Design an enzyme around this catalytic site. Structure first.
Site, PDB file in Angstrom:
ATOM      1  N   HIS B  41      70.209  63.832  16.035  1.00 35.90           N
ATOM      2  CA  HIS B  41      68.829  64.627  15.263  1.00 35.90           C
ATOM      3  C   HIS B  41      69.253  65.679  14.910  1.00 35.90           C
ATOM      4  O   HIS B  41      68.572  66.549  14.259  1.00 35.90           O
ATOM      5  CB  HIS B  41      67.718  64.513  16.269  1.00 35.90           C
ATOM      6  CG  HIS B  41      67.797  65.345  17.291  1.00 35.90           C
ATOM      7  ND1 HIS B  41      67.637  66.857  17.146  1.00 35.90           N
ATOM      8  CD2 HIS B  41      68.390  65.289  18.701  1.00 35.90           C
ATOM      9  CE1 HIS B  41      67.743  67.584  18.363  1.00 35.90           C
ATOM     10  NE2 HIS B  41      67.933  66.323  19.502  1.00 35.90           N
ATOM     11  N   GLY B 143      67.231  74.249  21.076  1.00 36.05           N
ATOM     12  CA  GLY B 143      68.748  74.455  20.926  1.00 36.05           C
ATOM     13  C   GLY B 143      69.525  74.206  22.061  1.00 36.05           C
ATOM     14  O   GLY B 143      70.746  74.093  21.994  1.00 36.05           O
ATOM     15  N   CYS B 145      69.600  71.407  23.001  1.00 33.36           N
ATOM     16  CA  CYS B 145      69.993  70.056  22.763  1.00 33.36           C
ATOM     17  C   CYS B 145      71.671  69.789  22.658  1.00 33.36           C
ATOM     18  O   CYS B 145      72.459  70.710  22.047  1.00 33.36           O
ATOM     19  CB  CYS B 145      69.353  69.536  21.486  1.00 33.36           C
ATOM     20  SG  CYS B 145      67.717  69.477  21.582  1.00 33.36           S
TER      21      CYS B 145
HETATM   22  O1  LIG Z   1      61.918  68.694  23.046  1.00 25.82           O
HETATM   23  C1  LIG Z   1      62.538  68.424  21.880  1.00 25.82           C
HETATM   24  N1  LIG Z   1      61.884  67.676  20.607  1.00 25.82           N
HETATM   25  C2  LIG Z   1      62.698  67.742  19.399  1.00 25.82           C
HETATM   26  C3  LIG Z   1      62.276  68.146  18.025  1.00 25.82           C
HETATM   27  C4  LIG Z   1      61.683  66.720  17.830  1.00 25.82           C
HETATM   28  C5  LIG Z   1      62.923  65.957  18.270  1.00 25.82           C
HETATM   29  C6  LIG Z   1      63.490  64.454  18.137  1.00 25.82           C
HETATM   30  C7  LIG Z   1      64.691  63.986  18.655  1.00 25.82           C
HETATM   31  C8  LIG Z   1      65.114  64.979  19.648  1.00 25.82           C
HETATM   32  C9  LIG Z   1      64.956  66.200  20.111  1.00 25.82           C
HETATM   33  C10 LIG Z   1      63.599  67.013  19.612  1.00 25.82           C
HETATM   34  C11 LIG Z   1      63.761  69.110  19.972  1.00 25.82           C
HETATM   35  O2  LIG Z   1      64.655  69.378  19.175  1.00 25.82           O
HETATM   36  N2  LIG Z   1      63.508  69.201  21.414  1.00 25.82           N
HETATM   37  C12 LIG Z   1      63.831  70.151  22.624  1.00 25.82           C
HETATM   38  C13 LIG Z   1      64.959  69.535  23.510  1.00 25.82           C
HETATM   39  N3  LIG Z   1      64.964  70.301  24.436  1.00 25.82           N
HETATM   40  C14 LIG Z   1      64.350  71.660  24.735  1.00 25.82           C
HETATM   41  C15 LIG Z   1      63.297  72.057  23.891  1.00 25.82           C
HETATM   42  C16 LIG Z   1      62.661  73.101  24.127  1.00 25.82           C
HETATM   43  C17 LIG Z   1      61.789  73.608  22.919  1.00 25.82           C
HETATM   44  C18 LIG Z   1      61.247  72.839  21.837  1.00 25.82           C
HETATM   45  C19 LIG Z   1      61.890  71.694  21.863  1.00 25.82           C
HETATM   46  C20 LIG Z   1      63.006  71.225  22.706  1.00 25.82           C
END
Ligand SMILES: O=C1N[C@@]2(CCc3ccccc32)C(=O)N1c1cncc2ccccc12
Ligand SMILES: O=C1N[C@@]2(CCc3ccccc32)C(=O)N1c1cncc2ccccc12
Lengths: 302, 302
Positions: B41, B143, B145
């Site tokens: 993603h 971030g 991720c």
């Molecule tokens: O939770 C999500 N959803 C998001 C955006 C939608 C999505 C789709 C697939 C994978 C990840 C995502 C994303 O990037 N993250 C995050 C992961 N970890 C900590 C986070 C802390 C604050 C905000 C987002 C966070």
């Protein structure tokens, strides 16, 4: 989101951990530049630890009596001296992995990460706090002596070297200049720690971390620094100074709750308990997060 | 003595963390040999995340659309492919810091260490467990991720890459082959985790750690695997198998308490609560230590 007891990444300290041997005793030492730091009781047999005369015991020792091993490499000791309760073994090789570092004496209530080691090899890392009575509640087995505690300020600030366990099961040690934290000596006798108290400014920092993460059931009243402190003294909480209210300011600014309002919430928790609830997954008030720890975690300092 | 939630030393994983940029999105990736691994993603804008067609979205991308940065160095992308929910960016430089490693899919209830990262830089390390419902209760900001979870078996076994937070605030992600743990997809929709359960074999491992450390107030009766399991199902504890009784054997052998006797103690704690007491400093039953974790800590594997 989420909140965890988080330690600093330990890479920079791992590349400094060496194994020191004198006589039969083997413990861990810290190799920065051309000096190796370890607890001086490495020179002690078990008869010695009841009543060690360290000067006398160290006088019987020469450089070649110290086996410093770094990985498989064996370092060459060309100098030895005793600074307080730490031995400084000067060696023939500067450690190529020496990070930028400082030696620091932390204050009760501060936190730091511990890299627990045995025979010079890292085994685990955890986060803990210097208690108000200058002990630490660690995880240390025999031969973990010389494991170090540290902070990373973007530079490694070493603040703790582990020396001993008290019959309590709590742990005591020194700064990297060998001065013990607390009233303790490196000798096998009965040594009492003080009455322990709770780090009140840290508990408040955690309640702010709780609010930041959606746990708000304990909020409400106000109170005075003076009135709050009356409740704290009764519950063996350490007294809240105005430095402490100041340190919490940024945390206050980002949750929109005045420090003094947060203390009123705590007062009621102290008086009325938690009635079975939990806050951030804990059934107790947690005091091993500083306000800096909370801000570091809740906005991602790397 | 002492017992702490201990993570593996993180040095070996730090030297693998890189920062990956595609479009405006920047997250963390794992650089081993000449491949860089990151959540797919990263190729998604925020409009994309409601309903991403990943094949189609990745088809619009060429190698030069990916900015992989290692420290200050910028790596050169000469290949890209999508394995399940992970992107594999092949680059022009093998990472000289690549440790011995394996990719592993862990089982619910197992533990692992997490190196939380932002923009390719480590910020903290903590220990956690894959929940029975395949979520993790982490500490992850935007971030983070692409932060990885891992074990060190003397070799780094990577088992987890973080992808997303659910409205719950719990976290979900994949193994290093890109297969999610659990029923989750990398898309911004409502996704339910299962009912969570308690890892019963881990709680028992912790009670043994408690006995090892002098906390014995909860001991006593016996019961049957069958009888005990009846109490567990009522309290949303995961059922105790005989593999589970077997794994606890060495722990049983060193405390001189049969597993089945320990379960009778737990049954009474489940039925009667803790009546205000604590065990190893916790007012709750802790389930994020495996029996291997307990043995690793209580005899010093390095
Ligand atoms: O939770 C999500 N959803 C998001 C955006 C939608 C999505 C789709 C697939 C994978 C990840 C995502 C994303 O990037 N993250 C995050 C992961 N970890 C900590 C986070 C802390 C604050 C905000 C987002 C966070
Ligand atoms: O507690 C002590 N006392 C000892 C011997 C007496 C002494 C004098 C000065 C400094 C240290 C010590 C020592 O070496 N240790 C240990 C430190 N840490 C974890 C331990 C786990 C198990 C057994 C001992 C441990």
């Amino acid at each position: 989101s989420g909140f965890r007891k988080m330690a600093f990444p330990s890479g920079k300290v791992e590349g400094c951990m060496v194994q020191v041997t004198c006589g039969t005793t083997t413990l861990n030492g810290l190799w920065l530049d051309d000096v190796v730091y370890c607890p001086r009781h490495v020179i002690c047999t078990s008869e010695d630890m009841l009543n060690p005369n360290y000067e006398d015991l160290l006088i019987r020792k020469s450089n070649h009596n110290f086996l410093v091993q770094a990985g498989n490499v064996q370092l060459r000791v060309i100098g030895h001296s005793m600074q307080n309760c730490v031995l400084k073994l000067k060696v023939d090789t500067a450690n190529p992995k020496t990070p930028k570092y400082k030696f620091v004496r932390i204050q009760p209530g501060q936190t730091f990460s511990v890299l627990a080691c045995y025979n010079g090899s890292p085994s685990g890392v955890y986060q803990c706090a210097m208690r108000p009575n200058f002990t630490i509640k660690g995880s240390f087995l025999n031969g973990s002596c010389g494991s170090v505690g540290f902070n990373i300020d973007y530079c490694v600030s070493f603040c703790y070297m582990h020396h001993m366990e008290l019959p309590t099961g709590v742990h005591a040690g020194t700064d990297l200049e060998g001065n013990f934290y607390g009233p303790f000596v490196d000798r096998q006798t009965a040594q009492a720690a003080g009455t322990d108290t709770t780090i009140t400014v840290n508990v408040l920092a955690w309640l702010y971390a709780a609010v930041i993460n959606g746990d708000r059931w304990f909020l409400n009243f106000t109170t005075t620094l003076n009135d709050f402190n009356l409740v704290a003294m009764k519950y063996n909480y350490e007294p809240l100074t105005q430095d402490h209210v100041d340190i919490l300011g940024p945390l206050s600014a980002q949750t929109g709750i005045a420090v003094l309002d947060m203390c009123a919430s705590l007062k009621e928790l102290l008086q009325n308990g938690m009635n079975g609830r939990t806050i951030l997954g804990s059934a107790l008030l947690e005091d091993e997060f500083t306000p800096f720890d909370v801000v570091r975690q809740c906005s991602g300092v790397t």
